[PDB]
């Protein structure tokens, strides 16, 4: 039978400094036990100063990261330009991905 | 399951209820009143699904008083069990139905007299002297069957439950917390605060 | 007949321009904005004096940093400060944040044009346009304190200072030269209580008219009776003061 | 499917199917209310245009919405059956939801939002009734009454009256009743109603009806006779002059 | 009150304007057509007329094929004529899906005649300004001419005619019946029932006919067609060795 | 657009009346009388079939009369079309009623309920009213004998004798005149009968132009027995009342 | 698109007066006459063919239709506003009656039915009342033989004996004059003869006479034999043969 | 005549004219003027905000679209909102689906056809507002002028609003000069100026009266207000 | 009476619809556009007239294409023609979805012309202010067709439709009769450009841009094309030329 989700491994980390603040990954995405790239970003510059990463299953990850830009985008059509302040930012996020509590985007998200 | 009793005596109804309220390994309550009264003469114990248990009689509750303030009038027992039992035999073949078994225990004014209705959650209603729901009445019956006299007295009937609690307590697995118990007659509805040692 | 969104010769929508006739014989309502806050009074304008004038609501809060004063047919307000409040409390809930008093307003002004008996454009489903302006105040911190004055048009402007219902073109020629940029949240108090007392028919008093502001420091408040009373007095002695 | 809109703007700002209901409203029984300094009072007028009815299942003119709010009208009958219904469920459902009943400002600001909102709504005429609603807030003694019109606004009333000739009694309570010292009492306060009534009714023993709504869900009609009690004292006061 | 005359509502005498005017429209093309019935045919002759020297005379056309079996021509402007054409086409189809078996001409008839007198009812709907007239080779019926107009009314003829000189064609066909006693013309071959056809046309209408002015179906058993330029001109030319 | 052929049902005149309302009662005056009248043990309900022939059959006939119930009854007055509209939902609520709580519908609530169908004409839709006006005749345990009125408006009232259709103004006046309390339901049959009487614009009362029931709780029986007097029962009564 | 016309056609004037309905009744007076004759033992039902033309074919086009097998209709007005409510009285017959209890319903019950039809087209939104009215006869087990009437209101009522269209009037009396309760089919069938008579202004013989009667069984049409309890239908029309023999007898 | 014609854009009059439609462009004419030109490597957008009172704002009268597109709007301003939120989220399906940037002839093409649909069913009303929009697309600079009856046309230049006429005649003349200000974003910006100063009158461009949008080769839409325009007054 | 004009789907008592008559008027106020069939294709032509210095040259076409080998022109109301190519291709993606082949060219003119006639049986449309010129190349040769705002429509050899459309017919009645054997794609460019060139006299007052497409089995392979550079100056040359 069809199953909607796979798992394109990858580790990404988050790390907050004092005045800065980084977000890394490996650049590896895999099927099983193939690598399908060895240079594949996976954290994103969002705008707004936001790095984002929804790591799990690629293309879960990559719809994601998707609405959260077009999210951002929206936001200055809709608010003057406002800058998002990233807890508003996060606090988006859990709206998109409760959006889909029963049909989980299959991925564990760090921005 | 919970316990659920009720007794028809001479002049009313005599409702039995157990008090726990148990969510998988730890007992959250010991003084739980399983009941609602749908109007001053009516009153409804119900036992079963969790959430739909009380879900259920407050929407039974809400409808009946809502009757009343549009007639200016109280239904009679055997309309409100009616009522009743066709919400259930709506719920039981709906997308997801109501698990609740109830007790009806009213005092019907105009025939001056006491009356008990039992309906599970498939809508299945039946008229008696004394009922139950689930395990009690396996506990139960023998004694009523026994000791039951259609002239008692509510002192006589609260006795009878008091042996029928015992025999509850003695045999039964489950820890219950006792029960509370109320009287419905021609005066209404009353709580009797007294039986943890009657 | 005629539909409800029709366009007279002159390019202008019947049943807007008659929304605004309505709006002229509403209870004055008037806005002033200034650096140390908003300030917004209203006429209660009690129709007998079996009436209790203090269950009289033109002036209500939106949220802690925006409220409004509404003038013309009082009960079509109700729906839209629903739907204003909803959408200040939803914002938050979505940004974990404030929502600015201009986006707050936009979302209001949203509903004005949506009647209509079948309009192409989406399901606008209401009969006829609102019968009532409102004057939206509050603070945000991209653009501090302002004033809006949103119609049943759809369209809204800002104010440094604004009148709205029965004398609003005698009361905008009088804020047109009291207002200046330094004026002072006292100052425009006692400035909007002079002016509701000019254009009112009863002689303004604590029972018939309503201050309230806004100011970052505190949000949005109804002054209370007493707290206006004194206001009141203050403004007869400066003004018998020459 | 019938959404034509009816309730539209004319020329000068005026929405002529509200207005018309007004004059449907007019045209109802008088209706007035006035609350003590513990208690609310409702009268009414009993038309005659046909004597011969039926009084005990004939609809009475003060209905209540729960166990301690009552409502009047004067207007459209059928009319404002439907809106008590709807008040009377409204009634329920918040006890429901709140687990409290409905404070006498919120059932009335529910009537008045159901009145706006059949005055901008295609495919229907606004509803020709006014009313007066009554009571006393839960685990509150001071007493409450409200006014609600087709327009859909509504505010709250020492004492009111609405229908016809409440031109006339509202100008005898304007200058006969006092906030200083209200009604202090379920009987001077039933005499000032009667009072009013009187003004209009022209000798209605059978054509004047009041019921006392007091803290509680307290809320009892009078009698023909007790009423009736209450012209022949006044009857007096008058002639004893 | 004087909207009673715009849509399809009773006058006070108890008339229903609309669909009058309806009828009237069926002749804004002025044209005209007939249609007998052979021993074994059917056929049905039409005016063809191509007045603009740009237009493409090959598509212009009042005769439709509905299906195999029926033949459709029509009175009226050529959009609700193509309207009925469209719909009668599809009903054709459907029938045959459903029953398993053709749809026999007088129940298409009926079924749009109904379709009509809809229109007549609903106000929303206008009534069509066309006649059709619906023939075929019934299985069980045999040579068949249902017509239907804007009233919603229908019923089977022996010979019928439609157009503005609608009269004159009918009372000539109605006087050769008189005179033969029978309800058809006796002939065994399509051809000859197809002279018949253009003769009488040419009496009643007082003129003469080149092989573009006409424009001819026949329907026979399991077959409707129309006849070409030529195949007409093969006719004209018969029925010109006679007189 | 359409918006040019409507006629707006549902509005209110610069008076404040529904112009369909009234406008369906006046209606309503020119159809055939129908009389209902209340005694201690019993409802009489009586009603002139308007328009009649040699050969209408009227033993196979029911214009006016109509059960509802085993226990409620209507006479109607207006377009008989429409009443058989109302009627049939009329039957369904006493039905729904019925099934729900096992007991028979309460009079009032049934009357209440085809009214407010009636008023929902008067404020929504874009439809015409019903022109029909109602006479209820019934009986429940709550107040016993009742009688009810409905029209087109949607209001309804309770009385103890009434009439509705032609000539009501003259007919009430006679009732209000020769009604008392302590009626028999022989007495109010021979009021109804009387009154009809002298209200009709026909010649004479013939039987084969009325309609006549009644709600009676027959002693020996101790139940409500509702009687739709057949012609031949018109016909003698008509003779014993003296008016041959 | 859409129907947008969800307001009614038909409403009331300020005598009280319904103009839609009253102008379908007008339309019905200018149709062709019909009429039906109830007797001990049948009913008869007779209307005239008024041919449009020598060239249409007149049976092609029945007038009076067969409801159920014991139940037959005929008219008088708008032909097509006719010919779609036998559709829908033919359907309504089993959807809410056959389907149900497995039999055919009873003359009353569908009368019932038609008319109720017909009020809604005096009601509903963005229609006009039908312009005809019908004359339905038939017999059930338990009432027997019955004819009635229906007009455009919706309106139906049980007769002895009526006429509906052009010269109802005169045809009324003279049915009022022959009648009697003691009738036998073939009396009524003649009296119906004679009566339509008097409004035919050409031809006066089968063929362009409908005439139909509701009767004893016919097992002989019905088809098939094995089931004891189907002894063939009541309602049968009679055949231009069959009329003309008559006709002799006139 | 007219009068029995005009009650809705559904009905054509005898000489087969819209006027709910032109009654509609009527409100255009009411509103404030609003520039448009370009170069070949520029886009210039120059709207006179018009206040209320002397106490009110100068409503916006420019709306960005995406990030190489935008307009100026002159008449209902809630239409143009309704306009551009539709522009808005055509520009976002094509860079979404197609991750492409929609062609502003595209987007003219677009805004006709919604335009189109409220001008021949019943019930609805024609847009009241005019728009001129701006884009650097695949194919350079465009200006496109749209009208509520539906019309779009692609221009060098142009101006709609009240004595709009006045700035038309101007850039008609200036066509052969500003054309060629490519690479010079300020000097396109000057002739805007220069244009939209031609339909003036009553009183003169100010600051916080003043408004420029710009969008080009390399330059993403941008708007410029107050302060930022002060160096053009 | 009157007012017989004021609603779409109404008859007058001439069997008339008014409003497409006025429709029509629409049309005839617009651009003159106009369609050449040839041996083995068709052409499309039409006036664009220059309303100042400030259009872009070129830019603003106006002949739209449907599917891959549809060519449609039309004058009137601009946005109505688009609105009825919108719906053409819509029509033309489904039919060719279903059966593969693409559309015949008799197909889809029926197609429009259902479509049109639609707007006509309704008063809640308004019927098209357009008339459309369209065809290609198909299975059995190349068809054009001309669509009025009632719906009707029918096969050209060539036809106009705008403010010049009598002098365009009058040059197309020549080029039939001096032809009878059949232009070539490549005259009927030239041929066509003439026809706009004369036509425009009737608006001589603007000045215009002209556009051509066409569709020929062997000039474009049976594929819709816009006639540029080169040969579209040559076919404005032959114009100007005999223009004098």
């Given at each position: 039978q069809?199953?909607?989700?796979g798992?394109?491994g990858g ?5 907050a ?5 980084v977000?890394?990954?490996d650049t590896?995405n895999?099927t099983?036990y193939s690598?399908?790239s060895?240079?594949?970003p ?13 790591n ?6 990559d719809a ?16 003057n330009?406002?800058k998002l302040?990233?807890?508003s930012?996060?606090?988006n996020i859990?709206?998109?991905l ?5 049909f989980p985007?299959y991925?564990?998200?760090?921005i | 399951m919970?316990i659920?009793?009720?007794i028809?005596?001479q002049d009313?109804?005599i409702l039995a209820?157990?008090?726990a309220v ?6 959250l309550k010991?003084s ?5 009264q749908?109007?001053?003469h ?12 009380v879900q259920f009689?407050?929407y ?7 009757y009343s303030?549009r ?8 309309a409100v ?11 039981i073949?709906?997308?997801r139905?109501y698990?609740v078994?109830?007790?009806?225990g ?5 025939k001056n007299?006491p009356?008990?209705?039992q309906?599970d959650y498939?809508?299945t209603?039946v ?6 729901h689930g395990?009690?009445?396996f506990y139960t019956?023998s004694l009523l069957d ?5 002239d008692?007295?509510?002192?006589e009937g609260l006795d009878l ?7 509850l ?15 419905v ?6 709580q009797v605060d007294?039986?943890?040692?009657q | 007949?005629?539909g409800?969104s029709t366009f007279?010769?002159?390019?202008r929508?019947?049943?807007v321009?008659y929304?605004?006739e309505?709006?002229?014989?509403g209870?004055?309502?008037i806005?002033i904005?200034?650096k140390?806050?908003?300030?917004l ?7 007998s ?5 203090d269950?009289?609501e033109?002036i209500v809060?939106?949220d802690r940093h925006i409220?409004?004063?509404?003038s013309?047919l ?5 729906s839209?400060?629903?739907?204003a ?8 809930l979505?940004?974990?944040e ?7 307003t936009?979302?209001?002004?949203d509903?004005?044009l949506r009647?209509?008996?079948g309009?192409?454009?989406e ?14 105040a509050?603070?945000?911190?991209d653009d501090?304190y302002?004033?809006?004055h949103a119609?049943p048009?759809?369209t809204?402007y800002?104010?440094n200072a ?8 005698g009361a ?5 030269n009291?207002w200046?940029?330094?004026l002072?949240?006292k100052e425009?108090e006692l ?7 000019q254009?009112?028919?009863e002689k ?5 008219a309503?201050?309230?502001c806004i100011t970052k420091?505190d949000?949005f408040?109804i ?7 004194e ?5 007869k002695?400066k003004?018998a003061?020459e | ?8 703007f004319?020329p ?6 509200v207005?018309?209901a007004?004059?449907?409203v007019k045209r109802?029984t008088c209706?007035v209310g006035v609350?003590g300094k513990?208690?609310?009072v409702?009268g009414?007028?009993?038309?005659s245009?046909?004597?011969?009815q ?10 209540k919405?729960d166990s301690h709010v009552v ?5 459209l009958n059928a009319?404002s ?8 469920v409204?009634?329920?459902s918040h006890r ?5 009943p ?9 009537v008045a939002?159901?009145?706006?909102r ?10 020709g ?5 009554a009571?006393?807030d839960p685990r509150?003694?001071?007493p409450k ?9 509504y505010?709250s009333?020492s004492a009111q ?6 031109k006339?009694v509202r ?6 009743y ?7 009492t379920?009987?001077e306060?039933?005499?000032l109603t009667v009072?009013?009534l009187?003004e209009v009714?022209q000798?209605?023993?059978k054509?004047?009806?009041i019921?006392?709504?007091?803290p509680?869900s307290?809320?009892?009609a009078?009698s023909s006779?007790?009423?009736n009690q ?12 | 009150?004087g909207?009673?005359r715009h849509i399809?509502?009773?006058?006070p005498?108890g008339?229903?304007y ?9 002749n ?6 007939l ?10 002759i ?6 603009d020297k740009l237009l493409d005379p090959?598509?212009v056309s ?5 299906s ?5 021509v029509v009175?009226?402007?050529i959009?609700?004529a193509?309207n009925?054409?469209?719909?009668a ?10 029953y398993?078996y053709?749809?026999?001409?007088d129940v298409?008839?009926k079924?749009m ?8 009812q609903?106000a929303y709907?206008r009534?069509?300004?066309v006649?059709?007239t619906f023939?075929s080779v019934?299985?069980?019926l045999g ?8 009233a919603?009314?229908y019923?089977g003829?022996?010979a019928?005619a439609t157009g ?7 009372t000539?066909?109605?006087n050769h ?6 309800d ?5 071959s ?6 018949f056809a253009i003769?009488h046309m040419?009496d009643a209408?007082?003129?003469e006919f080149s092989?573009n002015?006409?424009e001819?179906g026949?329907?026979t058993?399991?077959?409707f067609?129309t ?9 004209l030319?018969?029925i010109?060795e006679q007189? | ?7 707006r049902?549902t509005?209110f005149?610069p008076?404040?009346?529904?112009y ?7 209606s ?10 209340m005694?201690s043990?019993?409802?009489?309900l009586?009603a002139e079939?308007k328009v009649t022939?040699t ?5 196979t006939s029911?214009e006016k009369?109509?059960?509802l119930?085993d226990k409620?009854?209507?006479?109607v007055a ?5 009443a058989?509209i109302?009627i049939?939902?009329?039957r369904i609520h006493a039905?729904?009623?019925?099934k ?9 609530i049934l009357?209440?309920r085809?009214?407010?169908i009636?008023?929902?004409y008067?404020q ?14 019934g ?6 004998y009742q009688?009810?009125?409905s ?11 009434i009439?509705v259709?032609a000539?009501?103004?003259?007919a009430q006046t006679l009732?209000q005149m020769?009604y ?6 022989d007495?109010?049959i021979e009021?109804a009968?009387?009154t009809?009487?002298k ?6 009362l013939t ?5 006549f029931?009644?709600?009676?709780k027959?002693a020996?029986?101790?139940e409500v027995?509702?009687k739709?007097?057949k012609?031949?029962?018109i016909?003698?009564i008509l003779?014993?009342?003296g008016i041959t | 698109?859409?129907?947008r016309?969800?307001?009614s ?6 005598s009280?007066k319904?103009?839609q ?9 200018q ?5 039906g004759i109830?007797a001990?033992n049948g009913?008869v ?5 008024k041919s449009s033309?020598?060239?249409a074919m007149?049976?092609?086009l029945s007038?009076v239709?067969?409801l159920?097998?014991?139940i ?10 006719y010919?779609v409510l ?7 017959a089993h959807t809410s ?7 055919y319903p009873?003359?009353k019950?569908?009368?019932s039915?038609?008319?109720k ?19 339905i006869?038939g017999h059930?087990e338990?009432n027997?033989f019955?004819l009635?009437?229906v007009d455009?209101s919706?309106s139906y ?5 009526t ?5 109802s009037?005169a045809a009324?009396?003279?049915?009022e004059?022959?009648?009697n309760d003691e009738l036998?089919?073939?009396?009524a069938?003649?009296?119906?003869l ?5 409004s035919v202004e050409?031809?006066?013989?089968g063929?362009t006479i409908e005439?139909?009667?509701?009767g004893?069984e016919n097992?002989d049409?019905?088809?098939?034999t094995g ?5 063939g ?13 008559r006709?002799?007898?006139l | ?5 005009d009650?809705?854009?559904v009905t ?8 709910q439609?032109e009654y509609?462009?009527e409100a255009?004419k009411?509103?404030?003027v609003?520039?448009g030109?370009?170069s070949?490597?520029?886009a210039?957008?120059?709207?006179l905000?018009r206040?209320?009172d002397?106490?009110?704002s100068?409503?916006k009268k ?6 190489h597109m935008?307009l100026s709007?002159?008449?209902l ?17 094509s860079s979404?689906?197609?991750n492409?940037?929609l062609?502003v002839?595209?987007?003219?093409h677009l ?10 069913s019943y ?6 507002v005019?728009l ?6 695949k194919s ?5 002028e749209?009208?509520?009856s539906?019309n779009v ?12 006429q006045g700035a038309?005649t101007?850039?008609?003349?200036t066509?052969?000069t500003?054309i060629?200000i ?9 002739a805007?100026?220069e244009?939209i100063?031609?339909?003036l009158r009553d009183?003169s461009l100010t600051?916080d ?6 969008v080009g080769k390399d330059?993403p839409?941008t ?9 053009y007054? | 009476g009157t007012?017989?004009?004021l609603?779409?789907?109404v008859?007058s008592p001439?069997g ?5 008559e006025y429709?029509?008027?629409?049309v005839?106020?617009?651009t003159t556009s106009?369609?050449?069939?040839c041996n083995?294709?068709v052409?499309?032509?039409?006036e664009?007239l220059i309303?100042?210095?400030?259009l872009?040259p ?9 599917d891959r080998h549809?060519?449609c022109?039309y004058?009137?109301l ?8 919108n719906?053409?291709?819509e029509?033309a993606?489904s039919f060719?979805?279903l059966?593969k082949?693409p559309?015949?060219?008799p ?6 012309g259902?479509?049109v006639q639609a707007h006509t049986?309704?008063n809640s ?5 357009v ?7 198909d299975?059995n ?5 001309m ?8 096969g050209?050899?060539?036809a106009?439709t705008?403010?010049?459309?009598q002098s365009?017919?009058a040059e197309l009645?020549k ?7 059949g ?12 026809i706009?060139?004369l036509?425009?006299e009737?608006?001589?007052?603007k ?10 089995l062997?000039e474009?392979?049976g594929?819709?094309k ?6 579209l100056?040559?076919?404005?040359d032959f114009?100007?030329?005999e223009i004098?």
């Amino acid at each position: 039978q069809f199953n909607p989700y796979g798992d394109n491994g990858g580790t990404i980390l988050g790390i907050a400094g004092e005045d800065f603040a980084v977000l890394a990954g490996d650049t590896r995405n895999i099927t099983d036990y193939s690598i399908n790239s060895r240079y594949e970003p996976k954290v994103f510059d969002c705008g707004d100063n936001i790095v984002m990463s929804a790591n799990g299953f690629a293309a879960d990850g990559d719809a994601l990261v998707k609405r959260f830009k077009n999210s951002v985008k929206w936001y200055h059509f809709d608010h003057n330009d406002k800058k998002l302040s990233i807890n508003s930012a996060a606090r988006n996020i859990q709206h998109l991905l409760y959006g889909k509590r029963f049909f989980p985007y299959y991925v564990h998200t760090i921005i | 399951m919970d316990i659920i009793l009720g007794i028809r005596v001479q002049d009313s109804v005599i409702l039995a209820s157990s008090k726990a309220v148990t969510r998988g390994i730890s007992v959250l309550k010991d003084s739980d009143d399983k009941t609602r009264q749908l109007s001053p003469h009516t009153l409804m114990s119900f036992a079963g699904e969790a959430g739909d248990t009380v879900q259920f009689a407050e929407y039974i509750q809400a409808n009946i008083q809502l009757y009343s303030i549009r007639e200016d009038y109280e239904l009679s027992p055997q309309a409100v069990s009616s009522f009743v039992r066709q919400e259930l035999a709506k719920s039981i073949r709906s997308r997801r139905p109501y698990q609740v078994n109830v007790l009806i225990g009213g005092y019907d004014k105009k025939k001056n007299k006491p009356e008990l209705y039992q309906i599970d959650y498939l809508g299945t209603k039946v008229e008696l002297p004394y009922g139950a729901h689930g395990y009690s009445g396996f506990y139960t019956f023998s004694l009523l069957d026994h000791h039951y006299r259609p002239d008692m007295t509510t002192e006589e009937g609260l006795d009878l439950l008091k042996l029928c609690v015992q025999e509850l307590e003695k045999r039964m697995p489950m820890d219950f917390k006792g029960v509370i118990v109320k009287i419905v007659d021609k005066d209404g509805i009353r709580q009797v605060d007294d039986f943890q040692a009657q | 007949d005629r539909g409800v969104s029709t366009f007279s010769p002159e390019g202008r929508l019947f049943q807007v321009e008659y929304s605004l006739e309505a709006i002229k014989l509403g209870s004055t309502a008037i806005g002033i904005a200034t650096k140390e806050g908003v300030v917004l009074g209203v006429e209660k304008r009690a129709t007998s004096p079996l009436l209790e004038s203090d269950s009289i609501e033109k002036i209500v809060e939106i949220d802690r940093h925006i409220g409004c004063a509404m003038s013309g047919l009082t009960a079509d307000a109700r729906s839209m400060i629903e739907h204003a409040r909803t959408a200040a409390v939803t914002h938050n809930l979505y940004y974990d944040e404030d929502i600015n008093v201009e986006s707050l307003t936009q979302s209001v002004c949203d509903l004005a044009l949506r009647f209509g008996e079948g309009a192409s454009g989406e399901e606008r489903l209401m009969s006829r346009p609102f019968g009532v302006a409102l004057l939206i105040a509050g603070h945000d911190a991209d653009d501090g304190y302002q004033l809006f004055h949103a119609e049943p048009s759809g369209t809204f402007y800002r104010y440094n200072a604004k009148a709205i219902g029965s004398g609003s073109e005698g009361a905008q020629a009088e804020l047109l030269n009291e207002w200046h940029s330094s004026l002072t949240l006292k100052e425009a108090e006692l400035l909007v209580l002079k002016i509701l007392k000019q254009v009112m028919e009863e002689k303004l008093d604590e029972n018939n008219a309503q201050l309230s502001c806004i100011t970052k420091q505190d949000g949005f408040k109804i002054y209370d009776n007493e707290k206006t009373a004194e206001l009141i007095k203050e403004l007869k002695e400066k003004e018998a003061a020459e | 499917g019938y959404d034509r809109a009816l309730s539209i703007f004319s020329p000068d700002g005026h929405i002529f199917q509200v207005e018309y209901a007004l004059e449907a409203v007019k045209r109802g029984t008088c209706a007035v209310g006035v609350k003590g300094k513990n208690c609310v009072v409702l009268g009414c007028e009993r038309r005659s245009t046909l004597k011969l009815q039926d009084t005990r299942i004939t609809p009475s003119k003060v209905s209540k919405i729960d166990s301690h709010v009552v409502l009047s009208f004067s207007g459209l009958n059928a009319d404002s059956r439907i809106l008590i219904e709807k008040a009377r469920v409204e009634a329920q459902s918040h006890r429901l939801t709140l687990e409290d009943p409905v404070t006498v400002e919120y059932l009335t600001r529910y009537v008045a939002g159901v009145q706006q909102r059949y005055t901008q709504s295609g495919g229907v005429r606004p509803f020709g009734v006014s009313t007066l609603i009554a009571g006393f807030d839960p685990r509150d003694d001071e007493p409450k009454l409200y006014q609600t019109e087709p327009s859909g606004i509504y505010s709250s009333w020492s004492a009111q009256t609405i229908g016809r000739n409440s031109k006339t009694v509202r100008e005898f309570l304007e200058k006969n009743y006092d906030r200083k010292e209200p009604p202090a009492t379920v009987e001077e306060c039933v005499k000032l109603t009667v009072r009013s009534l009187l003004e209009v009714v022209q000798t209605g023993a059978k054509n004047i009806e009041i019921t006392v709504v007091k803290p509680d869900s307290d809320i009892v009609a009078l009698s023909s006779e007790e009423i009736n009690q209450y012209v022949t004292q006044i009857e007096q006061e008058k002639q004893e002059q | 009150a004087g909207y009673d005359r715009h849509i399809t509502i009773f006058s006070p005498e108890g008339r229903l304007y609309q669909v009058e005017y309806a009828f009237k429209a069926t002749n804004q093309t002025n044209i005209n057509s007939l249609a007998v019935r052979g021993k074994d045919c059917t056929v049905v002759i039409s005016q063809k007329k191509v007045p603009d020297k740009l237009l493409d005379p090959t598509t212009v056309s009042y005769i439709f094929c509905i299906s195999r079996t029926i033949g459709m021509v029509v009175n009226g402007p050529i959009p609700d004529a193509r309207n009925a054409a469209l719909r009668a086409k599809a009903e054709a189809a459907e029938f045959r899906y459903k029953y398993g078996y053709d749809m026999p001409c007088d129940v298409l008839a009926k079924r749009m005649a109904n379709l009509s007198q809809i229109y007549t009812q609903r106000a929303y709907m206008r009534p069509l300004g066309v006649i059709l007239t619906f023939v075929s080779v019934d299985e069980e019926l045999g040579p068949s001419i249902y017509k239907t107009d804007p009233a919603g009314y229908y019923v089977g003829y022996k010979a019928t005619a439609t157009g503005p000189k609608q009269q004159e064609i009918t009372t000539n066909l109605e006087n050769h019946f008189k005179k033969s006693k029978i309800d058809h013309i006796n002939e065994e071959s399509w051809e000859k029932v197809v002279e018949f056809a253009i003769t009488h046309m040419i009496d009643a209408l007082g003129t003469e006919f080149s092989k573009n002015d006409l424009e001819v179906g026949v329907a026979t058993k399991d077959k409707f067609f129309t006849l070409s330029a030529e195949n007409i001109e093969e006719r004209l030319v018969a029925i010109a060795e006679q007189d | 657009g359409s918006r040019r052929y409507d006629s707006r049902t549902t509005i209110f005149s610069p008076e404040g009346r529904l112009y369909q309302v009234e406008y369906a009662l006046e209606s309503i005056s020119h159809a055939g009388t129908a009389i209902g009248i209340m005694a201690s043990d019993g409802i009489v309900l009586a009603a002139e079939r308007k328009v009649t022939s040699t050969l209408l059959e009227q033993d196979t006939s029911t214009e006016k009369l109509y059960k509802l119930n085993d226990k409620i009854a209507v006479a109607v007055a207006g377009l008989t079309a429409d009443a058989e509209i109302l009627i049939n939902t009329a039957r369904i609520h006493a039905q729904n009623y019925l099934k729900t709580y096992n007991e028979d519908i309460p009079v009032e609530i049934l009357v209440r309920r085809l009214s407010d169908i009636k008023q929902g004409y008067t404020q929504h839709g874009g439809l015409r009213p019903f022109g029909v006006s109602f006479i209820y005749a019934g009986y429940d345990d709550r107040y016993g004998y009742q009688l009810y009125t409905s029209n087109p408006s949607g209001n309804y009232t309770g009385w103890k004798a009434i009439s509705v259709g032609a000539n009501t103004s003259a007919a009430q006046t006679l009732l209000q005149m020769d009604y008392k309390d302590d009626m028999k339901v022989d007495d109010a049959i021979e009021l109804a009968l009387k009154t009809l009487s002298k209200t009709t614009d026909s010649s004479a009362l013939t039987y084969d132009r009325l309609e006549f029931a009644t709600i009676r709780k027959g002693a020996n029986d101790g139940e409500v027995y509702q009687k739709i007097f057949k012609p031949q029962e018109i016909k003698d009564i008509l003779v014993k009342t003296g008016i041959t | 698109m859409t129907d947008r016309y969800s307001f009614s056609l038909t409403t009331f004037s300020p005598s009280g007066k319904l103009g839609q309905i009253d102008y379908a009744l007008t339309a019905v007076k200018q149709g062709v006459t019909s009429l039906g004759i109830k007797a001990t033992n049948g009913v008869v039902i007779a209307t005239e063919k008024k041919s449009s033309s020598p060239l249409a074919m007149s049976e092609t086009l029945s007038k009076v239709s067969l409801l159920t097998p014991d139940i037959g209709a005929v008219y008088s007005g708008m032909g097509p506003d006719y010919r779609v409510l036998v559709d829908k009285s033919r359907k309504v017959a089993h959807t809410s009656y056959k389907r149900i209890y497995g039999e055919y319903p009873p003359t009353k019950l569908l009368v019932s039915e038609v008319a109720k039809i017909m009020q809604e087209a005096t009601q509903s939104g963005g229609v006009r009342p039908f312009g005809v009215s019908l004359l339905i006869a038939g017999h059930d087990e338990f009432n027997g033989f019955s004819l009635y009437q229906v007009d455009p209101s919706g309106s139906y009522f049980p007769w002895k004996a009526t006429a509906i269209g052009k010269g109802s009037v005169a045809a009324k009396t003279f049915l009022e004059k022959r009648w009697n309760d003691e009738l036998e089919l073939e009396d009524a069938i003649h009296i119906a003869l004679l009566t339509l008579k008097e409004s035919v202004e050409g031809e006066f013989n089968g063929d362009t006479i409908e005439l139909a009667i509701i009767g004893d069984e016919n097992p002989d049409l019905l088809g098939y034999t094995g089931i004891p309890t189907d002894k063939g239908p009541r309602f049968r029309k009679l055949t231009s043969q069959e009329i003309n023999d008559r006709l002799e007898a006139l | 005549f007219r009068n029995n014609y005009d009650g809705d854009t559904v009905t054509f009059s005898p000489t087969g004219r819209l006027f709910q439609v032109e009654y509609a462009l009527e409100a255009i004419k009411q509103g404030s003027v609003t520039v448009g030109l370009r170069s070949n490597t520029h886009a210039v957008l120059v709207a006179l905000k018009r206040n209320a009172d002397e106490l009110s704002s100068y409503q916006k009268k420019i709306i960005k679209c995406d990030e190489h597109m935008g307009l100026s709007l002159a008449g209902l301003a809630p239409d143009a909102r309704v306009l551009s939120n539709y522009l808005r989220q055509q520009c976002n399906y094509s860079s979404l689906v197609f991750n492409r940037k929609l062609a502003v002839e595209r987007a003219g093409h677009l805004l006709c056809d919604k335009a189109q649909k409220n001008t021949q069913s019943y019930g609805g009303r024609p847009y009241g507002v005019g728009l001129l929009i701006i884009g650097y697309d695949k194919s350079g600079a465009h200006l496109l002028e749209f009208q509520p009856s539906g019309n779009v046309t692609e221009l060098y230049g142009t101006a709609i609003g009240a004595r709009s006429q006045g700035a038309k005649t101007y850039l008609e003349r200036t066509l052969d000069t500003f054309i060629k200000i490519d690479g010079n974003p300020d000097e396109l910006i000057k002739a805007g100026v220069e244009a939209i100063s031609q339909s003036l009158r009553d009183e003169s461009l100010t600051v916080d009266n003043l408004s420029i949008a710009i969008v080009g080769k390399d330059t993403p839409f941008t708007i410029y207000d107050g302060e930022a325009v002060a160096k053009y007054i | 009476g009157t007012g017989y004009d004021l609603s779409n789907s109404v008859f007058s008592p001439d069997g008339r619809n008014f409003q497409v008559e006025y429709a029509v008027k629409a049309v005839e106020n617009g651009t003159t556009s106009i369609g050449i069939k040839c041996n083995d294709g068709v052409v499309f032509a039409v006036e664009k007239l220059i309303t100042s210095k400030l259009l872009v040259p070129q830019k603003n076409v106006k002949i739209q294409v449907v599917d891959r080998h549809i060519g449609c022109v039309y004058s009137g109301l601009i946005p109505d023609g688009r609105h009825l190519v919108n719906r053409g291709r819509e029509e033309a993606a489904s039919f060719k979805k279903l059966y593969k082949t693409p559309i015949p060219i008799p197909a889809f003119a029926d197609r429009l012309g259902q479509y049109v006639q639609a707007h006509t049986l309704y008063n809640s449309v308004r019927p098209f202010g357009v008339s459309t010129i369209f065809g290609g190349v198909d299975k059995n040769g190349a068809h054009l067709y001309m669509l009025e705002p009632s719906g009707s429509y029918w096969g050209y050899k060539g036809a106009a439709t705008g403010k010049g459309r009598q002098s365009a017919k009058a040059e197309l009645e020549k080029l039939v009769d001096h032809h009878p054997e059949g232009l070539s794609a490549r005259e009927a460019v030239k041929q066509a450009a003439k026809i706009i060139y004369l036509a425009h006299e009737d608006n001589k007052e603007k000045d215009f841009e002209l556009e051509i497409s066409w569709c020929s089995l062997s000039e474009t392979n049976g594929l819709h094309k816009f006639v540029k550079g080169d040969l579209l100056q040559e076919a404005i040359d032959f114009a100007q030329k005999e223009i004098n």
